[PDB]
Design a protein around this ligand. Sequence first.
Ligand code: BCL
Ligand code: BCL
Ligand code: BPH
Ligand code: BPH
Ligand code: FE2
Lengths: 57, 250, 281, 48, 48, 48, 48, 48, 42, 42, 42, 42, 42, 42, 42
Amino acid sequence: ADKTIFNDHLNTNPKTNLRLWVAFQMMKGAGWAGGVFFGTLLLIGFFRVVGRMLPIQ
Amino acid sequence: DLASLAIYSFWIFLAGLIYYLQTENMREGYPLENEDGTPAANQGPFPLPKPKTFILPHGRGTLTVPGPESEDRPIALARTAVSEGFPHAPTGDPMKDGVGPASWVARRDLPELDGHGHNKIKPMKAAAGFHVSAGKNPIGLPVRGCDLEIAGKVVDIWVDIPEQMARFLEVELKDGSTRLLPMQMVKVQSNRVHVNALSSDLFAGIPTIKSPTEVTLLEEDKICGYVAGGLMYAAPKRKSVVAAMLAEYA
Amino acid sequence: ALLSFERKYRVPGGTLVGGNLFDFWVGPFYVGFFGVATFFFAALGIILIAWSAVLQGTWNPQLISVYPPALEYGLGGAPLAKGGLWQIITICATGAFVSWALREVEICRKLGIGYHIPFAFAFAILAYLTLVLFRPVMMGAWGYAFPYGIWTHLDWVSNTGYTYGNFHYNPAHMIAISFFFTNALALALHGALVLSAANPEKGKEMRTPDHEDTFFRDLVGYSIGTLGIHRLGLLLSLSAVFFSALCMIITGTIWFDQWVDWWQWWVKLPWWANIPGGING
Amino acid sequence: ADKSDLGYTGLTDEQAQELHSVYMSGLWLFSAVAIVAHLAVYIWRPWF
Amino acid sequence: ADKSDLGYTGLTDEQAQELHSVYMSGLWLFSAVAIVAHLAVYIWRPWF
Amino acid sequence: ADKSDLGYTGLTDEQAQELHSVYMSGLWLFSAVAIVAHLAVYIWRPWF
Amino acid sequence: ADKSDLGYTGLTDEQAQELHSVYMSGLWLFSAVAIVAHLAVYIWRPWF
Amino acid sequence: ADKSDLGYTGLTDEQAQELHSVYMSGLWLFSAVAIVAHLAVYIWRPWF
Amino acid sequence: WMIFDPRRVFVAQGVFLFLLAVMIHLILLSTPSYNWLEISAA
Amino acid sequence: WMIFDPRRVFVAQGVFLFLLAVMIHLILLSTPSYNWLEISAA
Amino acid sequence: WMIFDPRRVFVAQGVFLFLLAVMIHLILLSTPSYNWLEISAA
Amino acid sequence: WMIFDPRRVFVAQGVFLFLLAVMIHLILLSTPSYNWLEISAA
Amino acid sequence: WMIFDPRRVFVAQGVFLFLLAVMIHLILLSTPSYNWLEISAA
Amino acid sequence: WMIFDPRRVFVAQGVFLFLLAVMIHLILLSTPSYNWLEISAA
Amino acid sequence: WMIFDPRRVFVAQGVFLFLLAVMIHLILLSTPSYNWLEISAA
Ligand code: BCL
Ligand code: BCL
Ligand SMILES: CC[C@H]1c2cc3[nH]c4c(c3C)C(=O)[C@H](C(=O)OC)c4c3nc(cc4[nH]c(cc(n2)[C@@H]1C)c(C(C)=O)c4C)[C@@H](C)[C@@H]3CCC(=O)OC/C=C(\C)CCC[C@H](C)CCC[C@H](C)CCCC(C)C
Ligand SMILES: CC[C@H]1c2cc3[nH]c4c(c3C)C(=O)[C@H](C(=O)OC)c4c3nc(cc4[nH]c(cc(n2)[C@@H]1C)c(C(C)=O)c4C)[C@@H](C)[C@@H]3CCC(=O)OC/C=C(\C)CCC[C@H](C)CCC[C@H](C)CCCC(C)C
Ligand SMILES: [Fe+2]
């Protein structure tokens, strides 16, 4: 629960990595996305991913 | 005139305009002082000018500037390198001696004055100008510190008129002993507030404003500087803070 | 050397993971982790004014030239002074643009002044890029670029700037000029919005932000305050560049033709279509 | 009308329960409508 | 240990066994030893 | 020392501290180094 | 806590073990390594 | 944590555990990665 | 959190299908292969 | 540790050899009279 | 005394000479008439 | 039962498909009339 | 550890990407009609 | 819920079509193949 | 104050007399008669 030195834990089964980590921290990494890592991806990454069978003649 | 004349009243009358201008920006701050209180290395190629008379907006004296420059206020850095260059480190904890990222200064006991005959910054229980009388109105919600835990409850606003603005967000403690905190760092989204500067168990270390309605210019230095104190150290070293202090976007 | 109050501010850190290995204050200058980086970038860069001073011709930065590559060599290199040696100058330039705007953070995290400054040089990072990377990678080769000089890229912008007819017909360009003449439009009154109160005419008592509200409301009918014209300098000085990097990210790579021929897409409308009116009529 | 119930937002967990359902479950009323009208354009008129 | 006044620092013998013991390394290996490089110089080649 | 279950070993959670930095990030930056190369290889110059 | 005398820090005995083993060794591990490597540098190729 | 001696740090004998595998064989096999390559680039085709 | 819903996400279901439908229909309304609209002329 | 091993030479030397690799790719792959893979046409 | 020994005595000589040697090479390469690979191209 | 679960079940499917797929790639490379960039040649 | 870390994927996968890249080099560097680095004189 | 009803269902739903109907009829006013009223002679 | 001492002579004065020297030379080294460097043969 506490080491006194700082504000986290060593291991222990429950309580620790229980409903932190993937719950609160990098929650912005996906909400900001769907528009930045999805919106800049409709005419550039596809611009170079079809070239594989067609230009081969 | 001619084809070769006018570019010379310029390579001269302005070739000293970085010179004349620099000194006029080198009023405050200079002279240079060492790491103790000593006539330091020098000043530069554009040394500081001897100041002219400064008249103040509400009769605050003959405060010429550059003005007070000596060692009035307390400083507490244990000189690691006696040689001038390598940095210095505070005594105990750096957020008690007031050294490093958290800065303040000692001034005269006359707060910032406007022209109406009254002070500058007052709460909403010091100006019955704009109120609450339609629908449900949000002036009273819980908060959260950088430790990712609830910190207090803010239920008031310090009003402004000339700028029609805001400067502080007052926190009602469990008790009532006053505390303060800046305005631009804040990052509020829905129904709870999140500050990412100070932990929720280091808010009492922020001075109680001598008056809950007045901010003297003496007080307005640490009160908006303690949060900067937690923008440098915070926080060694492992786990949650690494997923809190780093990354982010805004 | 350091200032008088520069006593309490002296504290090690600021840099990220590794330690305080590079953060030694050499004089009035900051040599953080990106401090010795720019020391590495500024030392090699003075030689880049002197290299093509024996390959292209003259030794004086009046006509010194390390030209960009040709237009058609492909996705690759070049000769040398005419591209190859040009291809090395950029990643120092830009490698030095970067090691400067981000050595500020070793001072930003060092104290607690805001992170809106690793940013106002990043409209300069996104304004020099649009002439070295954004353009010449797609239309053929790195040959679509300007020279680095101070009189070479001059006769490159004018007598070699009418490829698109006139560039005033370029609407965003002209809006990124409807954004530029407005920079010193709001530095000329704001650089004089703090000057004349302790020095009114001589002796008089100093003004406060209520006289500001009887001088500028006695000026031009709009007084957003004093924090509305630092949101009125950082509104004059960063954007005349994204309206110019957009005046050119669809100019030449899509429109290498007359932009004087763009102002006939406006007169074409079903209402007044077959109709010559004025001047045109 | 969004995804679930009062109130939203919302929510905790969230993000692991918001941006996985607006493109697949909000598209479960569309992707099934897409499944059909794509097999006819596997021949007309890709090959003219 | 911190200081206060002119002209520390300074001071001594942090100035005596330090500053005296490093500055002449920049004021000899380049003052009279720089006239030892003048050897292959003063005759080569001012006179043609 | 070994344990019991699956993977154990494992070694939960040595299955998510060493199968992450060089297994995922090793092969994801083996996918961020291989896919990109193709984009100067696919057409230069199999088309001739 | 910081001390007083000459000079700190530090750190006697470290005037001949720290400031002479990785300080005066530079006057050798490259200063003389120049003199040997220059026997293959000074003559390439100032003489054509 | 740190010592006082030399290298300390160091950190004997990690001065010879972390500066033996990646430092010694580091500038040794890179003298077999960068140098052995020279032997096929000296002349093909700088000789033109 | 960190993704609005009462203000942002409501417009991402009602008209996101309206857009990515007709926005791809734009370039294929007068083309020399597929067609299937302006064929109605003979 | 005298030098820093997992800092100055694990991702800072991998780009230190990357320091002297590609800047010369724009000198030796350059040169106005070499090439020996480009001029397969003239 | 002072300065550094476990910090800044093995690094004030690594990239310092790289800031004085490997970028000094670019002067003896700013030549193309000498040069250890551009002698032939004269 | 028996065999190996913490041993020969993640190594019996790593050099077994690579010994049935990538070695099989060579026979569909044994084409030079098919082949996924030799079509330009034939 | 399901598989071996400092044994099967610190240099053994280094001869897995290396076992693929170079066996095909002498197919793509080769070929009777591609080259674009050999056929520049004749 | 979440977004306002009498500002997207009553009258603002009417401008989801008001200008959305006048736009498609601002493309086919100067068009011959349809027209259907521009000429009313015979 | 006003004028200190023990910093100017180390890094500034050495390049003040040098700065007072430099804007003088490139004219007397390049006057129609003087020069005194290049000419020593004829
Ligand atoms: C010296 C040679 C020419 C000349 C050289 C140039 C060049 C070069 C430029 C202009 C530009 C402009 N010139 Mg001029 N111009 C001259 C000197 C003048 C004088 C004057 C003598 O006092 C005036 C009043 C003007 C007027 C103008 C502006 C209309 C225009 C952009 C100014 C701006 O962005 O500021 C911002 C602040 C303002 C108060 C201006 C805002 C007013 C409105 C919004 C702008 C109207 C322009 C156009 C109609 C855009 C439509 C407006 C929309 C409704 C928003 N010019 C002389 C006659 N001028 C720029 C331009 O955009 O070309 C037309 C341009 O690049
Ligand atoms: C034919 C003549 C045309 C024309 C020719 C061109 C050409 C050519 C160009 C423009 C470009 C622009 N023109 Mg025009 N232009 C005209 C005349 C004008 C007039 C005018 C009133 O006369 C104005 C106001 C403008 C304004 C504009 C902008 C829309 C645009 C500028 C982009 C830019 O510079 O950002 C870029 C910002 C930077 C480069 C700053 C970056 C800072 C970097 C990171 C730091 C550098 C450090 C440095 C190396 C160190 C030096 C300091 C030392 C230490 C001392 N033009 C006429 C109409 N114009 C440019 C453009 O549109 O493309 C973007 C462009 O190429
Ligand atoms: C919209 C963005 C506008 C902007 C903003 C801006 N510029 C800024 C900053 C900001 C916030 C700084 O903080 C920084 C500064 O120090 O303040 C002045 C800066 C700055 N703007 C500068 C210049 C500059 N900015 C310009 C433009 C702009 N700056 C835009 C108008 C221009 C013009 C007229 O286009 C110039 C010339 C520098 C004084 C300074 C950048 C300081 C810096 O980052 O230094 C790093 C450089 C080195 C370490 C040198 C190494 C480089 C190589 C050795 C040689 C480079 C080769 C290159 C071709 C140089 C040639 C220069 C000219 C001949 C073109
Ligand atoms: C140092 C050079 C910079 C500079 C400086 C500068 N500009 C300045 C000033 C200064 C010191 C001012 O003092 C003055 C000012 O007051 O700023 C707000 C100004 C100014 N610079 C302006 C624009 C401007 N700035 C420019 C640029 C620059 N000015 C540089 C960046 C330019 C260029 C590039 O040419 C222009 C055109 C104005 C915003 C302002 C000039 C104020 C002025 O003279 O206007 C007088 C008022 C009128 C003419 C009112 C009439 C309005 C219309 C003409 C009539 C139609 C509307 C009317 C409402 C009809 C409707 C009927 C109604 C009755 C209902
Ligand atoms: Fe201002």
